[PDB]
Curated annotation (Swiss-Prot):
It comes from Homo sapiens (Human). Changing E116K: Found in patients with developmental delay and intellectual disability; likely pathogenic; causes an almost 4-fold increase in H3K79 methylation in vitro. Changing T93M: Found in a patient with developmental delay and intellectual disability; likely pathogenic. The modification Phosphoserine is found at S285. The lineage of its organism: Eukaryota, Metazoa, Chordata, Craniata, Vertebrata. In contrast to other lysine histone methyltransferases, it does not contain a SET domain, suggesting the existence of another mechanism for methylation of lysine residues of histones. Interacts with MLLT10. It is found in: Nucleus. S-adenosyl-L-methionine binds at residues 124-127, 147-156, 174, 210-211. This is Histone-lysine N-methyltransferase, H3 lysine-79 specific. The chain holds residues 5 to 331 of 1537 of the full protein. It is linked to Defects in DOTL1 are associated with an autosomal dominant form of global developmental delay and intellectual disability, with or without one or more major congenital anomalies. The patient phenotypes are characterized by central nervous system (CNS) dysfunction, such as mild motor delay and significant speech and language delay, and a range of congenital anomalies, including brain structural anomalies, cardiac defects, varied urogenital features and growth restriction. Variants may cause a gain-of-function effect leading to an increase in cellular H3K79 methylation levels. Histone methyltransferase. Methylates 'Lys-79' of histone H3. Nucleosomes are preferred as substrate compared to free histones. Binds to DNA. Changing N229 to A/D: Loss of activity.
Amino acid sequence: LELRLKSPVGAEPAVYPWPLPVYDKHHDAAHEIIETIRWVCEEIPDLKLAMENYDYDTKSFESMQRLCDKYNRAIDSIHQLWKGTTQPMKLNTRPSTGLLRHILQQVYNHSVTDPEKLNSPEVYGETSFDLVAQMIDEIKMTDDDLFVDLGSGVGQVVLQVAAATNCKHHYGVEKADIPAKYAETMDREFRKWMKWYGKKHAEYTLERGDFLSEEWRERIANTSVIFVNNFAFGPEVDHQLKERFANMKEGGRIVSSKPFAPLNFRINSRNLSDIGTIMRVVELSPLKGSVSWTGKPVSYYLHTIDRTILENYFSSLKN
Ligand SMILES: CN(CCCNC(=O)Nc1ccc(C(C)(C)C)cc1)C[C@H]1O[C@@H](n2cnc3c(N)ncnc32)[C@H](O)[C@@H]1O
């Protein structure tokens, strides 16, 4: 006993057992099915027309099977329309944000079956989707860039960014054995679903490793965009990263939850070896409604490597 959904681009259908599993208090497979059908109507305007007719009894097998069947047969109809003069769906484009959010929800739920082994507090960043999205809007990125998430967890922020941007490569690095294991599954599931919807992504890799290691020094030195959720790192790790940041090329960016250099920073003669000297540090606007683990309106920081701040001080003395 089963329900199946045909891929709009000929990939292996998606197959769900019945009764349909529940994922957590707020997500189940019924609604995964309903949403998936609606995003595919958004990809294909003709399907929207044919499907025009749709609430459903998610508990009733045959009320669900009707919806599936009506969806599968309209897909057949559509592939037939592409055999004619009509042109196939613009293939290897990138997913809209709405769709990406659905996809990453799907991938997670198919990959992290026991979310109980991920322990009370927010240290892995579960609903940071919108946040990363805002960040992706502000920090323009081009095919010249390299991106790294430092302490990449199960991998969701690497996948979101690789999907959204066109950097020449996207890296994630994780130290702990459990999430690196989950990240292997996440990577699989993501590739499969992205094919299923017929959507393109940038190159990305999910590695195992310590970002404080010797190999990672010059790796960090050559990365142009670094995302780092450093809220729970503690003072010693911050200090080590600061060192590694000193070797970064000009223009390099660092976006974080805690600042690595003060906002009010005027160079004087007692602070000459501070990282402050080599970087611009702004505070970014948070999203109305998001809160930190301290029940607190959040705040985030953009650091740009700009050495001309220093050059200027070695002229204010030649004055
Ligand atoms: C932060 N990270 C998991 C969160 C998943 N990724 C994010 O949240 N990225 C992210 C999210 C939001 C933002 C912004 C844009 C600031 C909002 C920027 C980045 C913690 C992981 O770091 C791992 N970790 C600890 N120290 C480690 C070490 N030295 N080397 C390897 N990994 C280590 C630790 O095991 C844990 O899995």
